Homo-oligomer: 396 residues x 4
């Protein structure tokens, strides 16, 4: 049929893929090649004028990476996809394709840090100005728009305390004033949230996280309309960042994404159990998780997301020293700064990533001294709860 017609789990498995026409191989072959041969001089010009269907060099396009791009276009309900070297490269290829000297961007403040440096330092050095706002208050977005504004940029849920942004409302706003809305959907995956279906124009992900899911690939993807994707490919990728994905990396992420549905169901079932345990514990002051009915935006969460996610933040009694003790006493959870792997990962920003930042500066950035972030994996939830209970008790 057409893969766009089956159920969502059937699409995760089949979309963008078929048996190799030449041999019947069921697995997508790894086309680990730099160049592609023509059968005549005429076929050579046909392709080079983009008139012919074909490949020319991998930096431009490849059969392996084309399969991954078509799969993720189906899952997010967009026209076309484009793969990239990193999550960062997906966001920069995007915004450097759209913007030029004299343009303006409105951005959420609560976004990924490497993204925050690109927007606050690199963009202004090329003539592109950025205003940062609290995107949980849609009126702040409206008040910062200018006649020069080309793009509005948001993430949801947002780190470190998992606050939300009302995608449908923000899209309407940006579009009223002739801007595009760009959403980073890395935290949720297309299994749990679909920003294009709520009005967004372009969606980006680090596949490094849940879409791959196995902790062994650095990569990104951009999904949107065909006429935007063509410019992102033939200008942004080709003539600006040079951030292409390797064919082996595309094959590993096609392999990881086959299990996306069954991994997201288990991540989210395990995280709800662990968040209820932490909510009842007398040494934990706060628990930030969208699935708990005390979250300040619980009802928006219930309309916009099909599940509440695999990430939890929480605050331990006793501040900086207590969080340092808790982290040093886990024996099953692993200390690391990534997320979305099959193993449970834990980190304590105040004593780890943000140790050089000044207390009152982190504080205005949402990061208290006792805040711990947990990426819940696929282990038995009992075992994770037991490791947490033991480390909390010691710490406190």
């Amino acid at each position: 049929s057409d893969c766009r017609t089956y159920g969502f789990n059937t699409q995760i498995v089949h979309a963008g893929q078929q048996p190799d026409p030449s041999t019947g191989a069921l697995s997508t072959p790894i086309f680990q090649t730099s160049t592609f041969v023509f059968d005549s001089a005429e076929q050579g010009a046909a392709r080079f004028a983009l008139e012919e269907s074909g490949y020319i060099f991998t930096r431009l396009g490849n059969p392996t990476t084309d399969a991954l791009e078509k799969k993720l276009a189906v899952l997010e309900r967009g026209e076309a996809g484009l793969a990239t070297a990193s999550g960062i490269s997906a966001i920069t290829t995007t915004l450097l394709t759209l913007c030029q000297q004299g343009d303006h961007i409105v951005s959420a403040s609560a976004i990924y840090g490497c993204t925050h440096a690109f927007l606050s330092h690199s963009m202004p050095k090329f003539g592109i100005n950025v205003s940062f706002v609290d995107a949980a208050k849609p009126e702040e977005i409206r008040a910062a728009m200018r006649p020069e504004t080309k793009v509005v940029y948001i993430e949801t849920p947002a780190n470190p305390t998992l606050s939300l942004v009302d995608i449908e409302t923000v899209a309407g706003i940006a579009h009223q004033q002739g801007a595009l809305l760009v959403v980073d959907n890395t935290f949720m995956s297309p299994y749990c949230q679909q920003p294009l279906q709520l009005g967004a124009d372009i969606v980006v992900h680090s596949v490094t996280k849940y879409i791959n899911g196995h902790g062994d690939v650095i990569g990104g993807i951009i999904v949107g309309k065909q006429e935007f994707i063509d410019q992102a490919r033939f200008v942004g990728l080709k003539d600006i960042t040079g951030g292409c994905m390797s064919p082996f990396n595309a094959w590993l992420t096609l392999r990881g994404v086959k299990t996306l549905g069954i991994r997201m169901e288990r991540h989210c079932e395990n995280a709800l159990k662990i968040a209820r345990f932490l909510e009842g514990h007398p040494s934990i002051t706060r628990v930030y998780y969208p699935g708990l009915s005390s979250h300040p935006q619980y009802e928006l969460g219930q309309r916009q997301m099909s599940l509440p996610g695999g990430i939890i933040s929480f605050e331990i009694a006793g501040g900086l020293e207590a969080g340092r003790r808790m982290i040093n006493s886990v024996e099953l959870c692993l200390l690391a700064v990534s997320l979305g792997d099959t193993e449970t990962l834990i980190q304590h920003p105040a004593s780890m990533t943000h140790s050089p930042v000044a207390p009152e500066e982190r504080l205005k950035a949402g990061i208290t001294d006792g805040l711990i972030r947990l990426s819940v994996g696929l282990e038995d939830p009992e075992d994770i709860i037991n490791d947490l209970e033991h480390a909390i008790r010691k710490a406190t």
Copy 2:
């Protein structure tokens, strides 16, 4: 000892590599990982302040890719290396790290086309102006410099007719006026030409070509001083292009580069034989190759390069139709647009890549109707000559 002390062939083999300290594995392991675990909260902050020796996430750095970077630093005689997703990404990470709105660049006109689009369209859209000149005349370089000029950019040899640029003379010029010189050494590899030893500040390569050598990796490398490489890594890569190399790609290129010396000796021995054959053939009007004593810059070539290279251009009698016939009649050489593989590759720009460009426009770009470009491989030179003789005879 110190790898910087052995002969050049010994360095190609050993530099940047050692047996795995943990197991004795002779091959560099493939660290195909997205993240790295800390043993305590304290080790986590140590590394994050860059105080500690270690890895954090692969986008930033990885043990596999660190080996490739250290090897190529040794071979070019530079302080440090930085690997990247493509040849394009090496050049863009470089120039976007150095330049900002209001700066100026002086560039050769005879450069790789994707590089020509980045410089003529993308840079001016960010506030960075570029002047193009004929770099074989060092006076044109001098006359275009301005008080705003940060960088001079050259390739040598240059495509499509293999003209040269006097690296030592151009370095002196740029430095007199306080600019940096950036050289693309893709065509020669560090086995045949060493731009840092002649005065250049930074060297870039597509490893896609000879450094890998096997037609199965898209990649780049930048070599320079440690204080420039640190900024290219922690700002250009991390916060601008996001163009990191995958660890599998770094491992394949470490494997390919082991044979660089013996491949470059054979490429260059085969190309001199084939260029002498073509020079004596009555249906060939011109032969462009640095090893023929009739090349207009033969003596500069003899001082700056240790061998004359594996690439040849040549013009066939009868213009456009004759070149189309010749290309369609080879049976051993393959039609393709890359170079530096183990197989011999042939292309005819006028009927292939540049068919949509207007005759008189290509002409001013050095490309006549009869020009063919040949990348000589590792086959028996007799067999390649026989395939050429047969196709020329038919065509003409």
Copy 3:
């Protein structure tokens, strides 16, 4: 702690694995090496006398493949593991290590065909005789034992009609007469059945099927006591079959097995729904599935297996021509002879694999003209049922 202490899902994730001691890499590195270097002459003899802990050459042992072997030892509750090139190599390395000229084997008749050729042709040519029996009747096993009998060999469930063998009862029998029991657990995986816990001495699997799960690796594993595994390694592998697993293949199977629990739960949930649909359909004469209470050995199944599996056989009304029509009319299920992949696979032995065998010969081998075998995947069960209903209706 000790991985042998956590819950089963925690073990699937963590057992046999840890962060790389040298770098902190979370993913097991790929040690794609043929040899290992010594630091002195003395360390060289230490290892060669097996006194020292270390590696020597990969055919013998490797850090990547050692991780997979230790994981699967934990999951089956055995002392040690040994990886191999194929499912076949696991069974042959096993039985050629145990047996010699003049020995005897008692085997089930209902086993995998390539195994049936090794036992009926290759073994007798080396002096080793084999008696085949119906292993669902434990008295037939007892009546075939001889004073020379070293090994009893069984599979359960068994193909093509999914009959069972009572592992606990057969172990007791073999042991009473001083033989070992060897069980092929390929169909169930250690998530659903644990033969060593019921009395078996040695368990073998093709990892090609569910343990890998992704249709991209050919491989096997043998699990047992350390003193048997040492002989299988240093004699059977080293001096008889030479069937070692590559380190890349071990890394892909470690990656696939991370999801084993969540894949087996979904395979088995989807297969029960599809088997109930087929049981109610008027054009299907029989349905063979252990989860249906009409299976002749339902209660044994309920004691020995934790779930009923992802495989179903069934007979369509109208014999040979009807089965050929049904197979040619599916549009989502794929025609192929493997099983345990993420995609649903279908086959019709009478018109496909066994077309050259004589009707009455196949018949005595359990294979009727209308028998179809289905390997249920991870797609939406509604979509699979709809594709079956459509193809059955046409066929019939």
Copy 4:
């Protein structure tokens, strides 16, 4: 044309390979798949009766590994090839396919040790007897043949002292009495020696050594007539050893073998220089190398081999303690037991591999206390000579 018509270097590059018909990809794709899909029930039976051209499962055959097999068939001038998991598996698949209970084998004594255990212990346990002789004296081969003799087995050159066997003379002998001759050509590669052209029936190699050449693959190949290769595939591989090669391993060895000609020329040029240096050194008692005119079989070497190889053995003054000191004092050569890598490898059997064997037993096995074996790599020969001179001087 037909690849069988070009020169030898052209064949190393091109034979068995072509651009992918479906996409034009120049590199052979990696078909990393376990199964292959049929388009109808009829195509399924066609292939299963071996009537149709196609693949079924990788254990049996694969497009990647088929390319490697066809290349090596061309290079050795045989009809067909068959790839395998290890060098050992190539030899065992071979001899277990040919022989059965009651048969006899005549073998050289001076062969690889793992091969010596298979022949002296495993074969007699299956009813197959073996007589060992000194194959440098063709009369000993003749005197051991019996009416039961099916196969004669030789290696040349032979380890540890590089003595030779006259292939043409031994073939004539075996054939006079109706046996097959099987030659292990691992030490030479098909670039330097071609046993099928001198009368041998079957040739085997470990590709682990020179054919791969890069120290990162364990593998083997068997080359012979099509009717022998078919039985080795459909019976020996399928029903006896199960020793198939993975498709990634076949792709790495296709990539390594592209440089075989240029690597063997440099290995052999470097080894002749190093063997002349050692021949003139007053602390070295003997030098075994086929290229020195004092080798006892120099003239046979000059007729049978096109170059003299990359391996050297030599004896240091002072016996066991002197060899232990020399090995512990090299700083560029690496201590290891493999050979044929791009790095120079050294070993001292008496203090390393054979430390547990009794002095007088090793002695009868050709191994004196002072014997060192050197595998010469691709480094600068000056650097290797300097490292040897320094270590010899200290030792002595």
